[PDB]
Amino acid sequence: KVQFVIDAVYAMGHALHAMHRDLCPGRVGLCPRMDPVDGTQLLKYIRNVNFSGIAGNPVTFNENGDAPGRYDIYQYQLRNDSAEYKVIGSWTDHLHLRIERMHWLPRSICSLPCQPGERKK
Amino acid sequence: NSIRIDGDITLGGLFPVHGRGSEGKPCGELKKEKGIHRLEAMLFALDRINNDPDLLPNITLGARILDTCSRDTHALEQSLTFVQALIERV
Amino acid sequence: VRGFDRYFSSRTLDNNRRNIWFAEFWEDNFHCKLVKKCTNRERIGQDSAYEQEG
Amino acid sequence: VGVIGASGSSVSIMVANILRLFKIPQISYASTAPDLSDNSRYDFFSRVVPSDTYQAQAMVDIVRALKWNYVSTVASEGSYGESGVEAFIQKSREDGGVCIAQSVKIPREPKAGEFDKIIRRLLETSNARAVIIFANEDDIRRVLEAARRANQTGHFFWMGSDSWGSKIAPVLHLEEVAEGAVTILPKRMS
């Protein structure tokens, strides 16, 4: 989450810089008209921030206020040498699971398929 | 607006005058059976307390009713306006 | 509780000021703007919509 | 001129509504609750992390790829846990067909021993080998500690939420009982 904190404060700084450039184009440094700060005026630039983050990922901007990023699936298992969270695959608009890298396959089923073709389910 | 009764002691009030609004309007139709009845109840209670010589003699109770619209955002906005007006006293 | 019943039946609502929402209540209760317009002599006790709330 | 959001979803909701009252923007980093993504109630809550709807979609995609259909929802109070378990239930009933054994919640201040019953209600049903958790670090560690007791080790795996995607706090009970626990975490980098 620290990368997210850094990206958030960098987006706020970029929004402040864009607001200073737009409201005060020919004024270097602090601008006198920027002292009465407004939440809507700052949000209008926060919702339009677009820059290269620290991890190379562009902070997307939208009218909703969310960033559609990937959700990496990690797993913590014991390897008898060094136990840590291992990543599986990316989430470029769909699933990218990798076989033979999970569960050192245990399956949770509500009712076992007992009938092999003779009994009823 | 809001109901404001001048008195020595002010009592705030949150009453759902309007109903839950849709995505277009913040406040819906006026709750005639829920909000207005409780409003009249509190007003009658305050009047009977002020007219009661045994309970709180020579002390008048005010009123600080505010519009709720059964919505948490509007009620919190009204509470913010109340705090800003205080910083009268309730 | 007969006290609130008497206070709501005897006292009329259109006369008492300082209650801004009571105007809209009277407007949407009689189903007419202030079309099927009505007069100020009408009361709520005669209306079947008045029910004592717990 | 602008406040940075909080971690807990309830605290984040509180500060978000209070700061949008006074017209001040807010950017969060660890509050992915879906009820905070609407522009009508939290218009000043532009966060930099995706919501829990994508998390529930990821959970249902994982339980589809792992061929899992019987799971048990558990979470603590606050907007985070309830919103996450509701989003997971909705995404599972929408098209995945996965149903839920039981939905038991963890109280705020459990007294006189009301925590062993939570894990007993999950151990009494052996078919629920999959458990999706949505609590914070404290309640998750307490659930893992309660599951480690009663002579139980590796009975059922845990589907970890965003609360402990890559946290080092719950790795002790993981090496103890919760071996091979699967969690989720948004795309980041060192």
- Reduce the secondary structure of chain C to three states and give it as a string: CHHHHHHHHCCCCCCCCCCHHHHHHHHHHCCCCCCCCCCCCCCCCCCCCCCCCC
**Strand spans (E) along A1-121:** 71-77, 84-87
CA angle B43, B48, B51 (to 5 degrees): 125
Tokens 């819906």 identify what position?
B28
Closest by Cβ to C28, choosing from B2, B32, B39: B32
d(CA C44, CA C48): 8
On whether the CB atoms of residues D98 and D92 are closer than 8 A, the answer is: yes
Nearest Cβ partner for A108 among D42, D68, D185? D68
Q: Phi and psi dihedrals of D40, rounded to 5? A: -95, -40
Listed residue (D79, D77, D85, D55) closest to D138, CA to CA: D77
**Is D40–B80 a contact, with Cβ atoms under 8 angstroms apart?**
no
User: How close is the nearest chain A Cα to the Cα of D112, in Å?
Assistant: 33
Residue type, A66: D
- Sign of the CA dihedral running A46, D187, D82, D69: positive
Strands B3-5 and B63-67: antiparallel
The residue to which tokens 């006198």 are assigned: A32
Indicate the DSSP class of residue D34: G
| CB-based contact C20 B41, cutoff 8 Å | no
Q: Of A65, A4, A39, A45, whose CA–CA distance to D19 is shortest?
A: A39
Pairing of the two strands B63-67 and B12-15:
parallel
Pairing of strands D70-75, D130-133: parallel
Rounded distance, CA B31 to CA C28, Å?
10
| CB-CB under 8 Å, B4 with C18 | yes
Scanning every residue of chain C, which has its alpha carbon at the shortest distance from the alpha carbon of B34?
Answer: C53
First and final C-alpha spacing in chain D: 29
Contact D143, D104 (CB under 8 A): no
Backbone angles phi, psi at B83, to 5 degrees: -65, -40
Residue whose entry in the numeric block shows the structure tokens 């626990």 = D181
**Closest of A12, A69, A1 to residue D7, by C-alpha:** A1
Q: Is C30 on the interface with B (CB under 8 A)?
A: no
Whole-number Å distance between alpha carbons of D49 and D5: 11
Q: Is B52 on the interface with C (CB under 8 A)?
A: no
| D112 phi-psi bin (left φ>0, alpha ψ -120 to 50, beta other) | left
| Structure-token match 């008209």, residue found | A33
Structure token pair of residue D5: 């959001």
> A residues 8-47 near D, CB within 8 Å?
8-9, 11-12, 16, 37-40, 42-43, 46-47
Resolution (A): 4.0
Name, in order, each residue with C-beta under 8 angstroms of B84's C-beta and a sequence gap of 6 or more: none
- Token match 């700060």: residue? A37
- The one-letter code for the residue type at B78 is Q
C35 CA: distance to closest CA in chain B (Å): 18
Cα–Cα distance measured from residue A35 to residue C43, given in angstroms and rounded to the nearest whole number: 57
Helix spans in chain D (H): 9-21, 52-65, 78-91, 116-123, 137-148, 171-176
> Taking Cα atoms as reference points, which of C29, C28, C24 lies closest to residue C50?
C29
Pick from A48, C25, D181, D139: nearest CA to B32: C25
SS3 B73: helix
Who among D21, D40, D41 is closest to B80 (CB)? D21
Distance between CA atoms of residues C42 and D113, nearest Å: 63
- Eight-class DSSP state of D139: H
**Integer Cα distance of D165 and A1 in angstroms:** 10
Instruction: Answer whether D17 sits within 8 Å of B23, measured CB to CB.
Output: no
Dist CA C30 CA C50 (whole Å):
12
The tokens describing D85, both together, are 């378990």
Burial of A5 (0-12, 13-18, 19+ CB in 10 A): middle
Distance CA D55, CA D159 (A): 11
Amino acid at D83: S
Query: Looking at the DSSP assignment, which residues form a beta bridge with residue B65?
Result: B3, B13
Task: List the single best residue of B2, B44, B47, B69 to mutate versus C (max C Cβ within 10 A).
Answer: B44
**Contact yes or no for B25/B31 (Cβ under 8 A):** no
Structure tokens at B84: 């800003």
Would the CB atoms of B40 and C49 count as touching at under 8 Å?
no
- The radius of gyration of chain C's CA atoms, rounded to the nearest angstrom, is 12
Rounded-to-integer distance, Cα A119 and Cα B12, Å: 70
Chain B, nearest residue to D39 by Cα: B23
Residue A73: count of CB within 10 angstroms of its CB: 27
Phi and psi at residue A96, to the nearest 5°: -135, 45
Residues D92 and D62: beta-carbon distance below 8 Å: no
